[PDB]
Write a protein that binds this DNA or RNA. Structure first.
Ligand SMILES: [Mg+2]
Ligand SMILES: [Mg+2]
Ligand SMILES: [Mg+2]
Ligand SMILES: [Zn+2]
Lengths: 349, 131, 38, 126, 141
RNA sequence: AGCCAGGAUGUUGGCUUAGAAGCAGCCAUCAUUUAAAGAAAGCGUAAUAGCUCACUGGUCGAGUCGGCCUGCGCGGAAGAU
């Protein structure tokens, strides 16, 4: 327990204080608060139970190491064995949790130019190998080639059962330091690539032309039509009550044709007013997720001279770069998921 | 409801009991409780078993139809709800008088200590049962 | 009071009465059930 | 308890002056938390909260609309106190008399704050 | 007899008093004290077993003093360890979860025959296997 | 039809969910004493508790309960000198 130990201790303290809070008969008077406490109590309880058991095992471990005149080896060996087993059990029982839908992966080049393209190719190959050694499905949607190397931007759609819950943490910016392929000398260069992972979502259109929420006004036309146009109601105006769009027609002589044309134009406008809203929402989300490639706002770093991959979110450094680049990045993901779930449990104020 | 068929069954099963029975009492417990009635029957049956024909079928021509053999003068129990209780083992058993302790046990209503009249008894308590 | 062309008994306490040639429903339990035919 | 903040945050000095003077006057105590320096006025009843803004506008020239910070039952308090002070820091505040107080959330969430320590935690100042 | 005045007929597994939400608020709005069950409710359960769920009643008079009496555990949990499976059914008609033989139904009868009404021990078992039938246990011959 | 009384015993049912205890929904729907009593038809709680009904015993003293084939009527039914 490098860092999660403090959070879990605070979590145990919260469990104790909610124990206290559920025995006063005054917080029982209101029902929203009591319902919320009863809901949040369960995960608090089981995680705190496991953590207290591990704490007791650890204080047993600390004891009996400063003792002589007896063969301490076997009992401390079995103690640390059961300690590690309990730790693994707690990890697997509180890491997971919902959202398990397929994903869209778009990775593009940042600082560096012709070498950010090469690193984008390498990064996409890593992700594709990880997807393949999971029996997931990967298909390419959009690709822009990178002249000297891989892709300036590659947008693929990864399909499986639980893709998002694993690949949602791979978003942001990634930094690489290495001697590039496009270098005449032996200088070491720094560059970055931006990754966005988004969920795939339904787009069920609805024919928002319900004839029960329309105000239809018929009246006389304006213009040159002689005696017939004067004594006839051949002009239409339709008002959509919720949205507020008003469209009117006086193009044709017949009322029915005017009504049909104006209704169709109203439908087109109400459809565009939805597309041109979800598009901006999605663009804003992708912009705020993608970051900005500047080799200074990054989520993890790869160093080929030292063969080291480091994650700055959790300050985790590993010297297994050559394994990671082949698609074994499940050891870069499990700590992130564990600590984020601990945080999500914490955020219950 | 019972048709004309099992009305015979309510008689044929019942008639055989006054023949082989002994001193029996009645009780007009218009307000009893099933938890009390669970203890009333099952304590009195606990002594021997299912030997109680303690059923409640006291219509003026549904329990009297079992009378013309024995307990002839007891047929005047036609009015408001009562409950027979028979004993085959033990003549003049507590079944008349073990209602008396039930009377003190939230059954103030016990048909006024009458019982049946084989020896031509009266409205009085017979608590005698030699051991 | 429900004014409708089809009046029915809803609960077990509703009744059908004719008052001056007009059919109507009344129940003592739920005042939401009283109706007249019109 | 409620939190007080004004409409032109360039007039903080006059707010502090008015609050300390009106705290001298009667029963309107003032608290400043160890963090994020947001004033909290603690009165004895609701109308004090009204008359305070009324005067603070009439005599001074600040408006000072209110907030709804959740808090109840502030309690006043060598190394024995220092260690607790550094341990539980986000819930400790200075008065207008530069004393120290433990801003809890609820009395139930205060007993556990005193069940763990040998600190008197008396409230009514000397 | 004293009917329901201000009390409730429930309580959680008796092995430990465990002033948890399953038992805390159950008497929370009735007042009294929760921890003092230990010297009144855990000493008695120290005889039988720890953690088995048994029912009691928490009959309380307006004096804020609690009087309570235990009884035999429910057949729902008593047909788990004897049945050999902790959990239970919930699709009993389509599929069954466990097995049970008439050997051990009567053996738990006397442990429950204290108040379970019945003509004899055998007839008490009909109700036991009736509740067992809907729990997904298979009758074993 | 009215009117008195009972309307219960091991499901604080696993399944589910913070609690679903007869009554949110998913599955079964047996069994004990019965004179009868649903492993629940409705109301009412956060969940209980609580109030009715299904069924039954007693009083009263005899007619009562829905359908089918048919004659005539009632509502549904609001306009401009
Ligand atoms: Mg023309
Ligand atoms: Mg100044
Ligand atoms: Mg007509
Ligand atoms: Zn009605």
């Amino acid at each position: 327990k490098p860092s999660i130990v403090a959070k879990l201790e605070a979590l145990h303290e919260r469990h104790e204080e909610v124990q206290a809070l559920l025995g006063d008969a005054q917080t029982i008077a209101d029902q929203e608060r009591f319902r919320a406490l009863s809901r949040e109590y369960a995960q608090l309880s089981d995680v705190s139970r496991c953590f207290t058991d591990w704490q007791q095992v650890q204080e047993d471990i600390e004891t009996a190491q400063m003792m002589l005149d007896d063969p301490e080896m076997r009992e401390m060996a079995q103690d640390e064995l059961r300690e590690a087993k309990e730790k693994s059990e707690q990890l697997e029982q509180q890491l997971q949790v919902d959202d398990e839908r397929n994903a869209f992966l778009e990775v593009r080049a940042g600082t560096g130019g012709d070498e950010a393209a090469l690193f984008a190719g390498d990064l996409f190959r890593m992700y594709s190998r990880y997807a393949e050694a999971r029996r997931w499905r990967v298909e390419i949607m959009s690709a822009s080639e990178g002249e000297h190397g891989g892709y300036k931007e590659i947008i693929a759609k990864i399909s499986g059962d639980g893709v998002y819950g694993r690949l949602k943490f791979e978003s942001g910016g990634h930094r690489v330091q290495r001697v590039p392929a496009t270098e005449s000398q032996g200088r070491i260069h720094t560059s970055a690539c931006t990754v966005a992972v988004m969920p795939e979502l339904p787009d069920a259109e609805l024919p928002d032309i319900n004839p029960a929420d329309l105000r239809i006004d018929t009246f006389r036309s304006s213009g040159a039509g002689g005696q017939h146009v004067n004594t006839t109601d051949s002009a239409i105006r339709i008002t959509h009550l919720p949205t507020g769009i008003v469209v009117e027609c006086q193009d044709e002589r017949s009322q029915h044709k005017n009504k049909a044309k104006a209704l169709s134009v109203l439908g087109a406008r109400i459809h565009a007013a939805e597309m041109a809203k979800r598009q901006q929402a999605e663009a804003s989300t992708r912009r705020n997720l993608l970051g900005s490639g500047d080799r200074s706002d990054r989520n993890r770093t790869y160093n080929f001279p030292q063969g080291r991959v480091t994650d700055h979110r959790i300050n985790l450094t590993l010297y297994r770069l050559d394994e990671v680049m082949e698609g074994k990045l499940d050891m870069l993901i499990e700590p992130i998921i564990q600590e984020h779930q601990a945080d999500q449990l914490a955020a219950l104020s | 409801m019972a048709l004309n068929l099992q009305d015979k069954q309510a008689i044929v099963a019942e008639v055989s009991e006054v023949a082989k029975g002994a001193l029996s009492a009645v009780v007009a417990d218009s307000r009893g409780v099933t938890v009390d009635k669970m203890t009333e029957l099952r304590k009195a049956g606990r002594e021997a078993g299912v030997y109680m024909r303690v059923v409640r079928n006291t219509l003026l021509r549904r329990a009297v139809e079992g009378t013309p053999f024995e307990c002839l003068k007891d047929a005047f129990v036609g009015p408001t709800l009562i409950a027979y209780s028979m004993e085959h083992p033990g003549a003049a058993a507590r079944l008349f008088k073990e209602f008396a302790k039930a009377n003190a046990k939230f059954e103030v209503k016990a048909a006024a200590f009458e019982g049946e009249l084989i020896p031509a008894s009266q409205i009085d308590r017979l608590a005698t049962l030699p051991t | 009071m429900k004014v409708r062309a089809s009046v029915k008994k809803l609960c077990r306490n509703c009744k059908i009465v004719k008052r001056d040639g007009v059919i109507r429903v009344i129940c003592s339990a739920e005042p939401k059930h009283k109706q007249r035919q019109g | 308890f409620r939190r007080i903040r004004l409409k032109d945050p360039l007039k903080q000095k006059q707010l502090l002056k008015g609050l300390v003077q009106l705290s001298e006057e009667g029963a309107v105590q003032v608290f400043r938390p160890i963090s994020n320096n947001d004033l909290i006025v603690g009165a004895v009843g609701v109308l004090q909260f009204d008359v305070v803004v009324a005067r603070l506008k009439s005599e001074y020239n600040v408006e000072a609309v209110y907030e709804s910070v959740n808090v109840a039952t502030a309690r006043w308090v060598a190394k024995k106190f220092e260690e607790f002070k550094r341990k539980n820091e986000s819930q400790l505040a200075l008065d207008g008399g530069d004393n120290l107080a433990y801003i809890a959330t609820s009395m139930v969430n205060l007993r556990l704050a005193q069940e763990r320590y040998p600190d008197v935690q008396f409230h009514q100042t000397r | 007899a004293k009917k329901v005045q201000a009390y409730v007929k429930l309580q959680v597994a008796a092995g430990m008093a465990n002033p948890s939400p399953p038992v805390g608020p159950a008497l929370g709005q009735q007042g009294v004290n929760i921890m003092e069950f230990c010297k009144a409710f855990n000493a008695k359960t120290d005889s039988i077993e720890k953690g088995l769920p048994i029912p009691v009643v928490i009959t309380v008079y307006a004096d804020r003093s609690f009087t309570f009496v235990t009884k035999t555990p429910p057949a729902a949990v008593l047909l788990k360890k004897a049945a050999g499976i902790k959990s239970g059914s919930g699709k009993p008609n389509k599929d069954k979860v466990g097995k049970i033989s008439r050997a051990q139904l009567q053996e738990i009868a006397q442990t429950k025959a204290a108040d379970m009404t019945g003509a004899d021990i055998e007839a008490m078992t009909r109700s036991i296997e009736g509740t067992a039938r809907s729990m997904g246990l298979v009758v074993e011959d």
